[PDB]
Amino acid sequence: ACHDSLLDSVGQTPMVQLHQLFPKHEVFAKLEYMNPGGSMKDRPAKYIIEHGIKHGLITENTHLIESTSGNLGIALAMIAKIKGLKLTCVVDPKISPTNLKIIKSYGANVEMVEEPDAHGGYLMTRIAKVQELLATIDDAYWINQYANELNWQSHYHGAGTEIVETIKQPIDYFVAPVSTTGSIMGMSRKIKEVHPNAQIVAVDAKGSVIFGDKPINRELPGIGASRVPEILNRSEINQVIHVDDYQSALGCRKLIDYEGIFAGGSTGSIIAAIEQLITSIEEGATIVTILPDRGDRYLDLVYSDTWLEKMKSRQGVK
Amino acid sequence: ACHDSLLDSVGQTPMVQLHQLFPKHEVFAKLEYMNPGGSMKDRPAKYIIEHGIKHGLITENTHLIESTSGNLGIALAMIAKIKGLKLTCVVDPKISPTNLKIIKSYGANVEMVEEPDAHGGYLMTRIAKVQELLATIDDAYWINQYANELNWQSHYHGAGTEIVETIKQPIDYFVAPVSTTGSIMGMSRKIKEVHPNAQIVAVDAKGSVIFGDKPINRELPGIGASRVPEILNRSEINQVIHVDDYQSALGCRKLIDYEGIFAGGSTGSIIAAIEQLITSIEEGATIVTILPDRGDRYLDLVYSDTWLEKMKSRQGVK
Numbered sequence: 001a002c003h004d005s006l007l008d009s010v011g012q013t014p015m016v017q018l019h020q021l022f023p024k025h026e027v028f029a030k031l032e033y034m035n036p037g038g039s040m041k042d043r044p045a046k047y048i049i050e051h052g053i054k055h056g057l058i059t060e061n062t063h064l065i066e067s068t069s070g071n072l073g074i075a076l077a078m079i080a081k082i083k084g085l086k087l088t089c090v091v092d093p094k095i096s097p098t099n100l101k102i103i104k105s106y107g108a109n110v111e112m113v114e115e116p117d118a119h120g121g122y123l124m125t126r127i128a129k130v131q132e133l134l135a136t137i138d139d140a141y142w143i144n145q146y147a148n149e150l151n152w153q154s155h156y157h158g159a160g161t162e163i164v165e166t167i168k169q170p171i172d173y174f175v176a177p178v179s180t181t182g183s184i185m186g187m188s189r190k191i192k193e194v195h196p197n198a199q200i201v202a203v204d205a206k207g208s209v210i211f212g213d214k215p216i217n218r219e220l221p222g223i224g225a226s227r228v229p230e231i232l233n234r235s236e237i238n239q240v241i242h243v244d245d246y247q248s249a250l251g252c253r254k255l256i257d258y259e260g261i262f263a264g265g266s267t268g269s270i271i272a273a274i275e276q277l278i279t280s281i282e283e284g285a286t287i288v289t290i291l292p293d294r295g296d297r298y299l300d301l302v303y304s305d306t307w308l309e310k311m312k313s314r315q316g317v318k
Numbered sequence: 319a320c321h322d323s324l325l326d327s328v329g330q331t332p333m334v335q336l337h338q339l340f341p342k343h344e345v346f347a348k349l350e351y352m353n354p355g356g357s358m359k360d361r362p363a364k365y366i367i368e369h370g371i372k373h374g375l376i377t378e379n380t381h382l383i384e385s386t387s388g389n390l391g392i393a394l395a396m397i398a399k400i401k402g403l404k405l406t407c408v409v410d411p412k413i414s415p416t417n418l419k420i421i422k423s424y425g426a427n428v429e430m431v432e433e434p435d436a437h438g439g440y441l442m443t444r445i446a447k448v449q450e451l452l453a454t455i456d457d458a459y460w461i462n463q464y465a466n467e468l469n470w471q472s473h474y475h476g477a478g479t480e481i482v483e484t485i486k487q488p489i490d491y492f493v494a495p496v497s498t499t500g501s502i503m504g505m506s507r508k509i510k511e512v513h514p515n516a517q518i519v520a521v522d523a524k525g526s527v528i529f530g531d532k533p534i535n536r537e538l539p540g541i542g543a544s545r546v547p548e549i550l551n552r553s554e555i556n557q558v559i560h561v562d563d564y565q566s567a568l569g570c571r572k573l574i575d576y577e578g579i580f581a582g583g584s585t586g587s588i589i590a591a592i593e594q595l596i597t598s599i600e601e602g603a604t605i606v607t608i609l610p611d612r613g614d615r616y617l618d619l620v621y622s623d624t625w626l627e628k629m630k631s632r633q634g635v636k
């Protein structure tokens with residue numbers, strides 16, 4: 001059937017078995033990067049904005065606000081443009097030129113903070129700037145990605161629903177990367193309605209504070225956070241695997257070599273994590289995962305040989 | 319259903335009506351950029367290679383060759399990686415860093431020519447280098463994009479077939495950009511089996527020699543050629559519209575503003591051309607077109623305000 005807008009092509013993404021990469025397990029990858037905006041963030045962007053419009057929280061006059069320099073900023077910018085809404089993304093000087101240019105191309109405003117925190121980052125500065133904008137822009141809506149229940153709900157109704165409709169056989173392990181935890185919370189909640197014994201495996205960056213790891217400098221965007229998200233309910237997570245920038249990059253390079261799938265940093269994290277998991281679990285297990293974004297924005301990260309060598313040098317004592 | 323590889327997700331791309339951009343006509347856009355490799359070139363890459371394997375022209379030992387710095391190189395690199403085939407793309411020093419890096423990321427070899435032709439380009443040098451490689455690499459297969467009948471056939475069986483299956487109402491105009499002409503030839507051939515009165519409108523770059531235009535320096539990749547492709551049968555084309563780099567870029571910017579679709583240069587060409595066409599045709603006409611690739615690789619072209627102003631300055635007497 002024809003679509004009336006690009007919004008109708010959000011979701012119903014392909015599911016692909018990774019036969020070459022995992023010859024002794026049944027590993028299914030949900031290709032969330034094949035959403036029209038280029039990442040899994042199309043799901044919460046569409047869902048959150050449409051819910052707010054339906055319930056009168058967002059009208060054509062409401063200005064959307066979020067602190068994001070990445071995939072969510074791009075997805076919000078696309079949905080906002082389609083809906084006729086103003087959007088301001090709060091960013092910092094570390095935003096990639098590419099992401100900046102894509103967000104501006106969709107007509108979104110960018111508010112770049114300049115003052116680092118005394119310890120050199122921009123996290124507290126960006127949190128403060130969000131509140132400043134909420135204070136000064138009348139009629140605004142804060143996407144509030146780390147705390148908004150509509151984030152996990154979008155994933156419960158989004159890939160989580162499509163996963164249980166496709167993978168009707170028992171799901172032994174569900175493996176997902178984390179930043180807000182909206183994906184793993186929403187998808188695991190849907191999965192376990194049908195597959196109550198599915199083990200839920202969170203994959204996080206080494207140095208991310210989500211599960212209390214000791215903070216280290218992290219290069220990869222997408223995976224990891226510098227706060228504990230309000231969305232997270234730790235009791236729903238059964239196993240936590242941490243992966244470093246080098247490990248994640250090797251996983252990306254291995255996936256493209258073995259399966260011809262060119263995916264982003266957090267997908268490599270997933271691959272590294274699944275390789276670790278299969279040293280402990282039963283042969284032949286059914287494992288489901290999600291591949292959030294494309295390799296295209298990681299050409300100077302993961303896919304750069306010079307960057308990879310620098311990351312290899314970081315592995316501390318190793 | 320689950321897929322066994324990424325290849326199964328080639329094709330069946332969305333069709334979207336452009337209600338905002340074309341409020342007085344029924345304009346349907348085939349989103350070929352939503353192919354897994356990021357462009358319409360997934361179709362000929364998959365089709366040509368699979369046909370050669372089926373018919374014993376290509377085995378696991380056959381080395382694929384093509385002169386391409388763009389979308390076809392990326393699509394071939396993906397299909398070759400999946401099939402376990404070696405690929406060498408012949409390129410020149412003008413290749414974008416991004417395309418170079420994507421092709422290398424998929425494990426393809428790159429043969430960059432260095433010697434310009436006496437008149438400063440690399441066209442004759444790249445044609446010669448292809449023949450050199452065919453002479454020196456035993457067991458090779460030249461994709462031969464400008465002359466290979468399998469190129470147009472991929473589009474006849476690809477988007478052309480999906481277009482007639484979806485748009486069962488009379489198609490008044492089919493509008494497509496050209497470089498090899500494989501798309502417009504194959505798609506128009508399928509369309510006119512069902513809709514014999516459909517008018518076939520080619521959209522080309524100003525300065526492209528395909529339809530004998532006077533050569534000028536052209537910035538946009540994707541649309542236009544510096545040869546008359548062997549694939550082209552001119553009698554099958556009913557109308558030819560030429561668009562310049564500025565016009566094409568305005569079309570891209572207008573499409574993203576009106577419909578939230580972030581597409582590449584040749585899609586903007588299509589938009590400019592359809593705007594010209596609707597000054598002559600009947601109100602309410604059904605127009606079908608194709609959007610070959612994403613805006614992401616045009617951030618320093620179309621989507622750069624500084625580049626756009628430079629292009630505005632080129633419009634000669636205008």
Ligand SMILES: *Cc1c(COP(=O)(O)O)cnc(C)c1O
Pocket residue numbers: 039040041071072177178179180181182183184221222223264266267292293
């Ligand atoms: C958002 C995102 C994640 C993590 O998803 P959450 O739902 O925020 O936990 C992982 N990788 C990429 C590339 C992302 O964009």
Ligand SMILES: *Cc1c(COP(=O)(O)O)cnc(C)c1O
Pocket residue numbers: 357358359389390495496497498499500501502539540541582584585610611
């Ligand atoms: C290949 C391509 C075209 C033209 O298609 P042909 O089938 O070669 O005529 C137009 N735009 C883009 C971006 C392309 O990749």
Ligand SMILES: [Mg+2]
Pocket residue numbers: 138139
């Ligand atoms: Mg106001």
Ligand SMILES: [Mg+2]
Pocket residue numbers: 456457
């Ligand atoms: Mg040999």
